[PDB]
Amino acid sequence: EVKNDDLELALKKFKRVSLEIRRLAQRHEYHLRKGMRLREKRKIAQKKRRKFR
Amino acid sequence: SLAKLGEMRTHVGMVKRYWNPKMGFFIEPERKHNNDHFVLELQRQSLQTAYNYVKEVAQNNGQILFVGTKNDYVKKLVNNIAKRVDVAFITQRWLGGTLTNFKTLSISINKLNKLVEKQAENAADLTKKENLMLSREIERLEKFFGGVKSLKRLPNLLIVDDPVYEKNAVAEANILRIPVVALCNTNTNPELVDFIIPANNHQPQSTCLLMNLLADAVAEAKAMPTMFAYKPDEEIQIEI
């Protein structure tokens, strides 16, 4: 992921890509079952589909 | 004239395909381009039948209620009718206990008359803010009961801007099983009026056509003036 843009605002753009990386990787840091994994993922997806769009 | 093609004009465009199919019984196949059309032979025959029916009904010195509370169009139409007629009329849409009982209307209209007399009298008896308060509250009373102050018996006939729109009007009209005429579109069902006259209301051209025809059908009952009942020529007007 290239971030060579400017000498002072690179971290500001780094924030959003870090947020995307987190939100795609926010489920592999603990033990859990498949059912709650699918439940949380699909519920968050259909909740974002209904409010922000 | 009556049941002649010269009246109807600009019957294009409805809501966005959100409706019930009961209209399909009495209307030609709807256009899928959101612009449902109403073949005018059925509209003209229904106009003739409804005109004769309500004329006969109102010839018996029955009471009529001219209430249409759409955005601005039918409101202005019924207000022009009211300033043209002596029959009762309501500028706005009421709230509850109007046709299901008269006790609720009784106190409201009695205090409306009392406050009319008060505003005719109260100019220095009270304070300035209290007087302005009474003026605004009598305006509020008159906007909902501008015709209730001219009748004791409930109207024997009425019209509505859209039966779905005035849910209270049709609800308390259907508390008893009574005849009614109205404007109905492809969206509603034919159980909301005992003699259906389906056409357009989205363009104002058809709305004013049907509304003035309905008003003028009962207009010539008590020897009262008329603008659109038998005129072969029509005037094109926009949302007012």
């Binding site: 992921e1 995307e20 589909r49 769009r53 | -």
Partner: protein, 65 residues
Amino acid sequence: YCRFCAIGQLRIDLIDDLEALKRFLSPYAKINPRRITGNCQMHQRHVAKALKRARYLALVPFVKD
């Protein structure tokens, strides 16, 4: 503008679409869903298989970009 099922050739596996994949998948390593590019069930499944095969082709890195 919708990107597949809108200009889609119905056959998106490896046919000279490398630049499109590099634009369909932004250089920040994310496959676009049907929610943005608008690709249909057909187009989205074939794009998914093609992109994961390109991942298994090192044309697009698995985790880098």
